[PDB]
Design a protein around this ligand. Sequence first.
Ligand SMILES: *[C@@H]1O[C@H](CO)[C@@H](O)[C@H](O)[C@H]1NC(C)=O
Lengths: 48, 48
Amino acid sequence: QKLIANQFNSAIGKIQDSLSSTASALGKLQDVVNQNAQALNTLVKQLS
Amino acid sequence: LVKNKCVNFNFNGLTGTGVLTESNKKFLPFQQFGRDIADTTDAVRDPQ
Ligand SMILES: *[C@@H]1O[C@H](CO)[C@@H](O)[C@H](O)[C@H]1NC(C)=O
């Protein structure tokens, strides 16, 4: 149990860091938000 | 000039309809229009 607790607790810790620094993991979510805000521009430009 | 109230306007050949207010965006002295990320007019300068 103990060992399994620490391996779990610590392994949680990385997830902060892995998110705290590297910005790539959220690409997916970050991609959807773009393509939506993307098309709107490309939609609005057409009014010009 | 009327503020905070939906109006129609023409400023020196700029034509548009909107709600004029006071702002804090420091416009360039030799400039005229502000604009926005979709290219739509987002501000003006009152020549008088
Ligand atoms: C508009 O008129 C007022 C007084 O008639 C004057 O003080 C002001 O400078 C004028 N605006 C410009 C841009 O000259």
